[PDB]
Design a protein around this ligand. Structure first.
Ligand SMILES: Nc1ncnc2c1ncn2[C@@H]1O[C@H](COP(=O)(O)O)[C@@H](O)[C@H]1O
Ligand SMILES: Nc1ncnc2c1ncn2[C@@H]1O[C@H](COP(=O)(O)O)[C@@H](O)[C@H]1O
Ligand SMILES: [Mg+2]
Ligand SMILES: [Mg+2]
Ligand SMILES: [Mg+2]
Ligand SMILES: [Mg+2]
Ligand SMILES: [Zn+2]
Ligand SMILES: [Zn+2]
Lengths: 433, 432
């Protein structure tokens, strides 16, 4: 406890103390950055930044820089010192590489593990995010290991672990915590109902759901909580190349982990960087060796506030607005989402999609037949009142956007076989997935 | 825990094993399964009493789902797993941190070594099964850079694994032997020669299916003559045998008592032909007493040229069961040796066969100029070596393994709800 190497909540009593925790790490950080081919080349000829003061002059690092430096242009240590290598989600054609030492991994795990509900050895923790190149599954599992929780590696987007099998695991293993994106929370609820289980009653050991990766309105988050019996839905904000940079407090806001990174809001028009306001999320992580980043622009649209929260945490808050005009009206996924998830929970509307045409908003959603026409009418009124856009809203039969087989299919985990008996299906010979 | 070199004879090995049995028998009796099994009676407590210990069947692990085999409080578990095979009847297994050190050490017994300078591509599943987690933990134990490929995942198609193999200078892979050929076919589709264009690739680790020496040597040749290092394991046991430099798998008998079960007689011997029985010696969470993995195996105590003081094991599994086809008996093992005895220039890697009562139906891919020579030579080989009537069909590449499997690229999408007029909104809630 005495010789803990990185700060934790409670180590500062003021914003000036926080700023000194940050400033004191900058000489080590600037020295480590200069070991990478990217920064050594950037500061070739000139004198590199070495002091906290020099940081004010440090040029933004763009997503496009990380892509151009693929794979190891940002690497500051020998490859012998790397523990894991990762690529970000998004375009497969233009990969974003990131990589971490064991010591880098302790910082990552500690940041994920800042869940206000706690992670305890008595928890059974279902990790239902991908383990394929992306960090998300590995990050949750490492936080689970750090805190002693029993980790169930569900993975996501894998033929080994369909939703039917995840519902069975949730129920029969008395799972206490989940990690999955907010769409997966509704997919698991629909799979539960398909198996004849009520998400709001039949999972009494489930005490919290951890989520990230999508823009999530308070309206949808509250509905996800309600679907699963009113348990906490605990949001964090991160990326493969940064780790977790903000986490929810008990009052439902995400706070920036400023003890572990310098956070700045970038106005691309102005080219200026401030500590707060509206603009693009810029990050300087303070406790990484392998892949130093100096003012990395995640290029997410964010609002950062230094206004105190009811939680009492001495950290700024962040709303993530995401990274369409129909006549004058701007329509965001966020605004439509608040209207869709304001429908009464009894209508069981979870799955929807919209297309922004120049002239009209096309919107489709699944609802059971009895409530479909009520739902279409109420959502139409809500769009008229709140957005005033012309719309074509179509109610769909369940199983049309999210097929019954996604919710109920069971899939044997087969190995390759080459010789078959007459009565066997040899179409699973070499293609056994 | 012992390492190779800690015993100088089979009697010393047996004493390393016997000395752990009191702790193991005591830990087993903490589980509801063994407590119930030995209810009323006095339980086995000594090395000598082990000779009387009843086999534990696969069906027992299934019946005890989920935590009937659990010997510690759930607070002490690190990870929970389910085995490959039938989804309808899950086999649960689970491990403490200390259980995980034994698992990682056993996997890390690769005669080629795992070193911090290695870049290690883990191309097996992380979904409930242990295999991806096991390789990653061994990688971490030894300081190798782990690239988590995963397998059976939409995030990591073959095209992307081939790109990573090449551009990251990958030195080691972990994937089943069919995935070794799938990566070779995907390599060619990306314009890369498996036998020349991956000069940093120094070894390929493999397991999970019956593998003849003939096929293993061909996999090595496809990838430029580098070592193909086989292990034998299961989700519920971990790695129980690993390859030596002479190309045989040795049982990790310092970490588990191995016995061959004859199902008709119900007897257990140290060696011979029968079903693989395992008593792991260094696990707390899920003690197993003579667990019958029910794989068909031959164990030999004949000394190996490698000088390792451990018995060797061939694993037949399902690949050893004879199908009767007219006069002859055919195993997958024997067919495999004939298919992979075709000249390497024919590029025959993907095949399948059906045992009919009257005839062996066999299909395989071979590129166009050589396809008919391949069909003729494989026909002659079957006549000379098996004498089965056969119908052999040579297929164009892309028939058994479609070109799309080898070349498809898939963006890793999040859910999107709002789309622009010109976008495909059939990626909305089904974004996988
Ligand atoms: N809580 C969140 N709210 C909104 N967007 C998020 C959130 N968490 C992550 N994201 C988005 O997901 C990106 C990270 O993608 P990846 O590198 O694949 O994890 C971020 O840069 C954001 O665009
Ligand atoms: N080297 C190997 N040779 C043959 N079969 C193997 C080998 N390794 C694993 N297996 C098979 O895979 C099973 C374990 O499956 P899983 O629990 O999914 O790892 C074993 O019981 C065998 O049937
Ligand atoms: Mg390394
Ligand atoms: Mg990203
Ligand atoms: Mg635990
Ligand atoms: Mg198994
Ligand atoms: Zn707060
Ligand atoms: Zn040997």
């Amino acid at each position: 406890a005495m010789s803990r190497s990185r700060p934790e909540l409670g180590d500062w009593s003021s914003p000036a103390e926080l700023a000194e925790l940050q400033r004191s790490q900058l000489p080590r950080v600037l020295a480590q950055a200069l070991r990478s081919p990217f920064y050594a080349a950037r500061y070739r000829g000139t004198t590199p930044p070495r002091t906290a003061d020099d940081f004010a002059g440090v040029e933004v690092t763009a997503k496009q820089d990380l892509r151009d430096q693929y794979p190891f242009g940002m690497l500051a240590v020998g490859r012998e010192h790397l523990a894991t290598y990762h690529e970000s989600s998004g375009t497969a054609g233009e990969p974003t590489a990131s990589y971490y030492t064991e010591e880098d991994w302790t910082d990552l795990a500690e940041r994920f593990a800042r869940k206000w509900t706690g992670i305890h050895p008595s928890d059974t923790f279902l990790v239902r995010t991908p383990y394929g190149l992306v960090i998300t599954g590995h990050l949750a599992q490492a936080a689970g290991r750090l805190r002693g929780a029993t980790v169930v590696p569900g993975d996501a987007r894998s033929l080994a672990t369909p939703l039917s099998r995840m519902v069975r695991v949730l129920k029969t293993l008395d799972v206490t915590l989940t990690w999955c994106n907010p769409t997966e929370i509704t997919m698991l609820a629909a799979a539960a109902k398909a198996a004849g289980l009520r998400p709001d009653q039949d999972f009494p050991h489930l005490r919290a759901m951890f989520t990230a990766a999508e823009p999530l309105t308070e309206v949808r988050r509250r509905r996800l909580s309600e679907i699963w019996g009113g348990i906490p839905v605990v949001e964090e904000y991160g990326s493969t190349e940064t780790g977790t940079i903000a986490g929810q407090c008990p009052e439902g806001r995400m706070h920036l982990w400023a003890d572990r990174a310098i956070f700045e809001v970038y106005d691309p028009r102005t080219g200026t960087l401030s500590e707060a306001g509206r603009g693009q999320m810029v990050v300087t992580p303070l406790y990484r060796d392998a892949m130093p980043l100096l003012r990395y622009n995640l290029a997410d649209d964010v609002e950062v506030s230094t206004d105190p929260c009811g939680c009492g945490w001495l950290l700024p808050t962040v709303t993530v607005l995401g990274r369409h005009r129909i006549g004058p009206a701007t329509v965001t996924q966020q605004r439509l989402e608040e209207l869709v998830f304001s429908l009464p929970a009894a209508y069981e509307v979870m799955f929807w999609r919209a297309k922004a045409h120049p002239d009209v908003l096309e919107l489709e959603f699944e609802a059971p037949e009895p409530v479909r026409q009520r739902a279409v009418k109420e959502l139409g009124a809500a769009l008229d009142r709140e957005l005033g856009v012309p719309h074509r809203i179509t109610g769909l039969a369940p199983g049309t956007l999210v097929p019954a087989e996604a919710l109920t299919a069971q899939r044997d985990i087969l190995k390759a076989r080459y010789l078959f008996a007459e009565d066997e299906d040899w179409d699973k010979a070499v293609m056994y997935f």
